[PDB]
Each structure stands twice: as structure tokens, then as C-alpha cells.
Amino acid sequence: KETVYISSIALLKMLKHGRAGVPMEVMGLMLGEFVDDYTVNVVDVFAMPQSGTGVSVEAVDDVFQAKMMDMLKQTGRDQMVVGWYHSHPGFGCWLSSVDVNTQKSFEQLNSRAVAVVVDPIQSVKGKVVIDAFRLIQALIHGLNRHYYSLNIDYHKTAKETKMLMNLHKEQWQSGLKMYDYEEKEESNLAATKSMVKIAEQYSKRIEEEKELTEEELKTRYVGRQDPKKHLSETADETLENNIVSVLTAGVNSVAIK
Amino acid sequence: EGKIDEAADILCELQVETYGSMEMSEKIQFILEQMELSILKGDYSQATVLSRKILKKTFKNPKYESLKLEYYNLLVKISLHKREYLEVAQYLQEIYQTDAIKSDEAKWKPVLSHIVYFLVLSPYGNLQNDLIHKIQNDNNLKKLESQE
Numbered sequence: 001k002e003t004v005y006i007s008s009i010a011l012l013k014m015l016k017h018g019r020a021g022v023p024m025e026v027m028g029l030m031l032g033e034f035v036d037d038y039t040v041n042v043v044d045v046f047a048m049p050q051s052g053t054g055v056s057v058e059a060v061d062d063v064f065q066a067k068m069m070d071m072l073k074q075t076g077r078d079q080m081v082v083g084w085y086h087s088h089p090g091f092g093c094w095l096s097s098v099d100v101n102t103q104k105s106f107e108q109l110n111s112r113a114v115a116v117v118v119d120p121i122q123s124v125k126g127k128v129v130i131d132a133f134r135l136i137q138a139l140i141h142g143l144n145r146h147y148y149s150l151n152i153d154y155h156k157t158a159k160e161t162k163m164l165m166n167l168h169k170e171q172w173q174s175g176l177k178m179y180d181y182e183e184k185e186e187s188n189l190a191a192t193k194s195m196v197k198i199a200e201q202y203s204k205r206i207e208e209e210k211e212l213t214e215e216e217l218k219t220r221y222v223g224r225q226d227p228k229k230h231l232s233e234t235a236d237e238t239l240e241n242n243i244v245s246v247l248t249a250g251v252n253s254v255a256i257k
Numbered sequence: 258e259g260k261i262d263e264a265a266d267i268l269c270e271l272q273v274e275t276y277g278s279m280e281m282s283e284k285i286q287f288i289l290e291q292m293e294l295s296i297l298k299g300d301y302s303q304a305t306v307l308s309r310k311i312l313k314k315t316f317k318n319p320k321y322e323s324l325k326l327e328y329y330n331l332l333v334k335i336s337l338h339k340r341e342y343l344e345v346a347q348y349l350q351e352i353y354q355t356d357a358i359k360s361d362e363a364k365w366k367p368v369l370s371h372i373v374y375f376l377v378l379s380p381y382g383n384l385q386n387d388l389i390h391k392i393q394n395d396n397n398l399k400k401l402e403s404q405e
């Protein structure tokens with residue numbers, strides 16, 4: 001039920017610094033605000049210099065930190081330090097015990113402070129691997145034992161999005177574009193489960209409608225819609241969406257190869 | 258003598274609550290005595306706990322910084338006994354961070370080497386990588402050749 005909302009600039013600065021430090025792990029701090037018990041919002045990030053030793057407690061640099069703080073004050077960015085990013089390149093997202101102790105050093109600052117692990121290399125143009133969570137593949141380290149996972153979402157202002165739109169100009173390329181497949185897996189599934197759901201509704205309307213007059217039936221059902229029209233209706237989206245879905249791939253395979 | 262087991266039995270404590278009463282020179286000093294008498298005792302548990310009770314930030318003071326070479330040197334010896342490695346390498350790292358042994362070229366070589374050998378013996382894992390790849394880029398490591 002608990003969650004964090006990670007603004008775009010945070011996420012991009014994140015992945016940038018991470019990808020830039022490869023193949024060594026980088027750390028930094030997270031600026032935001034705690035809405036309620038159920039939420040942490042992260043609007044900002046700044047990057048913490050390298051250390052001779054690995055990412056660790058003293059890697060956090062007071063001088064550097066406050067030195068950044070005030071200079072953000074002058075920009076009005078004033079926020080708490082709500083968590084700290086990090087990266088475990090190639091190793092997936094989990095906290096080593098050494099990650100843990102530091103996480104505690106951020107518990108005693110604020111009890112709700114969170115840990116964010118980013119994984120630059122295997123995060124790729126598909127799904128981005130990211131994780132945020134706090135203490136008490138990954139189960140080897142006691143995913144649930146010493147600590148526990150959290151959830152993540154992304155705040156987007158209208159204008160933000162509007163900038164992001166113009167990145168790709170798809171106006172020429174449309175029609176060879178194949179939309180995300182997993183999404184049409186939930187599509188082609190939930191659609192079918194639904195058709196099942198209204199099947200026996202159409203069954204009940206044919207039996208009841210059989211033994212009861214139309215004038216009586218209307219009184220009952222006018223509230224909802226004619227389950228025969230959810231068959232007639234719902235069959236379509238599956239039909240044509242799946243025919244363009246098939247054809248599009250049939251073309252990309254033979255044409256593009 | 259080996260009877261320092263019998264004697265040192267008492268000083269496995271006597272430092273305990275004298276924390277604020279002693280001055281850290283002497284204080285820490287015979288904490289270190291507790292260490293080496295604990296290893297020569299052949300018992301690492303009190304070396305371990307009697308060790309960690311010191312607080313590292315005392316190493317802001319160059320005075321105590323001169324001393325702590327002993328401290329880490331022991332922590333090495335312990336960890337070697339425990340068959341830990343990555344930990345050893347973190348210590349040798351830390352001593353290797355000392356200005357005094359940063360300077361002298363005849364100081365930091367045999368420690369730098371050991372840092373290599375242990376980062377080699379440690380099992381592949383998280384901190385092994387970035388520790389290695391940091392060493393990899395240390396200019397001084399150029400001066401060594403085979404180890405390089």
C-alpha cells in the first residue's frame with residue numbers, strides 16, 4: 001500500500017549518473033517530501049562524489065552535502081533528504097549488509113527514509129530495473145528478512161509530458177509501429193475473461209426473456225446494456241485489434257528482415 | 258609469559274567503563290594491548306568485541322592516526338585467521354589511505370600489493386568489483402608490474 005512517486009528529472013538524472021559510473025557503483029541523495037504514512041515523493045536528486053572505498057556511510061560527504069543544500073536554497077529547491085540512490089550494476093537490485101548499515105544511518109535521520117537501488121547495465125531500452133525499499137535473486141540476501149520491498153510510480157505534469165511527446169515524431173513512421181506486446185497480453189486475456197463473464201448473462205437473458213414478456217423485461221434490464229451487445233461489441237476489439245496486430249508483424253518480419 | 262592469559266583476564270574488563278575517565282592515548286593504547294594479548298591468548302572473540310568498541314572518528318586527530326596503524330594491522334591478523342579476505346582488503350585499503358604511508362614509496366608498495374592479492378582471493382561479488390576497478394585505475398598501481 002505504501003508507495004513513492006519519482007519525478008521525471010529525478011529518474012533521468014538517476015539513470016544518467018548510474019550509466020556514467022559503470023563499471024563502478026555510484027551513490028547520491030534524494031530530495032522530496034513525505035505526504036503521509038503511505039507515500040514518499042521524490043522531486044530532486046544530486047550526485048555524490050566517488051570514494052576510495054565503496055559506497056558506504058562516510059561516502060556521504062557532509063561538506064559536499066550542505067554545500068549543495070544552500071546552493072539549492074538559492075534556487076528554492078528546499079526539501080528533506082528522503083532517501084539515497086545507489087547502484088548495483090549487473091547484480092540486480094538488493095541491499096548488501098553494507099548497504100544495510102548505511103540505510104540505518106539514514107533511519108536515525110528519518111524513520112521513513114528509503115533506499116533506492118538502480119542497476120545501470122541490465123536496465124535496457126525495454127523495462128528499466130529500479131527498486132526502492134527499506135529495512136526492518138534478492139531472497140538470497142533476505143529480501144523479506146532484514147528488509148522489505150516498496151512500490152514506485154512517476155509524477156508527470158502536463159507540460160512535462162508535452163515536451164516528451166516531441167522527442168519522437170511518429171507522424172511518418174506510424175503503421176509500422178507495434179505497440180507493447182505484454183499490454184496486448186493483458187488485452188487479449190482480460191477481453192476473453194470478460195466475454196466469458198457476459199456469456200452467461202446473455203444466457204440468462206435468453207432464458208428469462210423466453211419465459212417473460214418484453215414489456216416486463218425492459219422494466220428490469222433498461223438500467224444496464226443488452227448483454228448481447230457486449231458480445232457483438234466486445235468480439236470486435238479482439239477481432240480487428242488482433243488482425244492489425246497479426247498483419248503488422250507479418251509485414252515487419254518479411255519487409256524489415 | 259603465557260600466564261598473560263591469567264593476568265589479561267582482568268583487563269578484558271578494566272577498560273570497560275573507564276571510557277570517559279581515561280585519555281584516549283593511554284585508553285586506546287591498552288585497548289590495543291587487550292588486542293594483542295587476546296590474539297596471543299589465541300582467543301579472537303574478545304579481540305573482536307574489545308576491538309569494535311572503539312569509535313573510528315577518533316582518527317580525525319593526526320596523533321591517534323599515527324597509532325591506528327597498529328589497530329588495522331591487528332584487524333588484518335584477525336581477519337586472516339577468520340579466513341575473511343574482502344574485509345582484509347578493506348582494511349589494507351584504509352591504512353593505505355594514510356598520508357604518512359601515502360608519501361613514502363617504500364611504505365605503500367608492500368601494502369598495495371597485499372591489497373591486490375586479497376582482492377584477488379576474495380570471492381567474486383558486489384564490493385569486489387568496484388574495489389578492483391578502483392584499484393585498476395589507481396596511478397600508483399602502474400608502478401608495480403606483475404601485480405599489475
Ligand SMILES: [Zn+2]
Binds near residue numbers: 087088095099
Ligand atoms: Zn550497494
